[PDB]
Ligand binder design. Sequence first.
Ligand SMILES: O=C(/C=C/c1ccc(O)cc1)c1ccc(O)cc1O
Length: 275
Amino acid sequence: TVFRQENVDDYYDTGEELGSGQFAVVKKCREKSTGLQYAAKFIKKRRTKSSRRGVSREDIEREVSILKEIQHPNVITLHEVYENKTDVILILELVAGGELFDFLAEKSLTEEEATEFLKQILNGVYYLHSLQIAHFDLKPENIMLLDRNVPKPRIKIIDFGLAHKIDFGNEFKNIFGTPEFVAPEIVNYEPLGLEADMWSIGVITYILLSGASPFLGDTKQETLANVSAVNYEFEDEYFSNTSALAKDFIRRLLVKDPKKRMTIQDSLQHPWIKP
Ligand SMILES: O=C(/C=C/c1ccc(O)cc1)c1ccc(O)cc1O
C-alpha cells in the first residue's frame, strides 16, 4: 500500500520534538492549509531486505492499517500518511499534556486518581479488544494526557507500533516490548493474544498505586526472569493504605496462565472498578 509522496514540508511545518526512539522520532507539526496541529511520527524505512535497521514495510503497513480502523476518545486518531525514500511519516493526533510516566514522577496517586486514569485506559483497551486488536506495548510511556493541568486529566494511548489484529485468538510472533511490562507469554515466546495487554494493565495499576515497578530487576534478564516466575509482592511500605480490593484487582491480572487472567470485560465488572 503506497502513501502520499509529496514532500511533507510543503504541507506542514514542524516544531518541538515530542518523542524519540530507535527507529522513529515524533515532532509537533502544523498543517499549512488549516492551521491545525498534529504530531508527525517519522519512521525510518529498512534500506535492504536483510537489514536489522529501520522498520520493515510489512510492520509499517500493519501499524497504519490498525490506526486507520480506530476512532475512540482514548486512542490517537491518524490524519494522513506520507512517505519518501527514507521514511514513512504518520501525521497523528497531537496529545500535548505529557506522559503518564512523567506526570507520575511529579507526585503515587490516591486510589481515586489512579482509578480515574485506569478507567480511561480500560475504556480504550475495551474498544481495541472489541475490534480484536492487541496493543502489545501498554506502558506509561505510551499513555499521554490531553491537558496535565486539570484535576482529572484525559488520556490517550498514543502509539501502535506493536499492535496486531488477533483474528484467530492468538498470533505467533515475537514482541520485543519493554521487560517491566510484558506478560510471561511474551517472555517465553509463546502464542500471544489480547490477554497480554491485561497483564500489562496489571503492572501499570501496581505502579499507579505505589510508585514502584513490580518485577523490575537490576538487569533486563532479571526483570524477564521475574515476570516469567510471577515474582512480585505488595510491599507494605508502599501499599499499607491501599485497599484490599485494589490489590485483588492487580492479583487477578498478574496471573501466569493467560486463560485464568481477567479479560477486559472482567476488569470493567470487577468490584474495584464497577459503579
Ligand atoms: O515518543 C513517541 C510517541 C510520541 C507522541 C507524542 C504525542 C503524540 O500526539 C503522539 C505521539 C514514540 C513513538 C514510537 C516509537 O517507536 C518511539 C517513540 O519515542
